From Swiss-Prot:
Entry remark concerning the domains of this protein: Contains 4 domains, connected by flexible linkers. In the active conformation, the domains are in an extended conformation, each making extensive interactions with the RNA polymerase catalytic core.
Family statement drawn from the similarity comment of this UniProt entry: Belongs to the sigma-70 factor family. RpoD/SigA subfamily.
Record protein name field: RNA polymerase sigma factor RpoD
Annotated signal peptide: none
Cell location: Cytoplasm
TM region positions: none
Task performed by this protein: Sigma factors are initiation factors that promote the attachment of RNA polymerase to specific initiation sites and are then released. This sigma factor is the primary sigma factor during exponential growth. Preferentially transcribes genes associated with fast growth, such as ribosomal operons, other protein-synthesis related genes, rRNA- and tRNA-encoding genes and prfB.
Organism annotation: Escherichia coli (strain K12)
Subunit structure: Interacts transiently with the RNA polymerase catalytic core formed by RpoA, RpoB, RpoC and RpoZ (2 alpha, 1 beta, 1 beta' and 1 omega subunit) to form the RNA polymerase holoenzyme that can initiate transcription. Identified in a complex containing RpoD, the RNA polymerase subunits RpoA, RpoB and RpoZ, CRP and DNA. Interacts with Rsd; this prevents interaction with the RNA polymerase catalytic core and with promoter DNA, and as a consequence, promotes transcription from promoters that require alternative sigma factors.
Length: 49
DNA sequence: AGTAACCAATAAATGGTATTTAAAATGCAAATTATCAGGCGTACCCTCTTTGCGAATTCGCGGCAGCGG
């Protein structure tokens, strides 16, 4: 709290990180590593636009 | 334009028994580079809300249930 910021501002980053890291590790039968998941997500975001 | 198979002889006829030759080639296990795979962190503020809508008008049957003398 010494930083003087609202709690939610800090907490949201950790929550997003945890959720996304898990959805990368689990959720596939054959486990693609994290970095490849990031690259595939970039690929898909570029393809739509 | 000349008979011999006489008895020695000559080594050539083989395909078989091996310790060699070292060169090669052929494999073998290191060093040594690339690249992949994990972990951490992010400071304006954000606070039950999304769902399934229906393994979808079945039907007939059974029976284990709650209310009731």
């Amino acid at each position: 709290y010494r930083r003087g910021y609202k709690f939610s501002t800090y907490a949201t980053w950790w929550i997003r990180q945890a959720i996304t890291r898990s959805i990368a590790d689990q959720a596939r039968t054959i486990r693609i590593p994290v970095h490849m998941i990031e690259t595939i997500n970039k690929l898909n975001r570029i393809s739509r636009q």
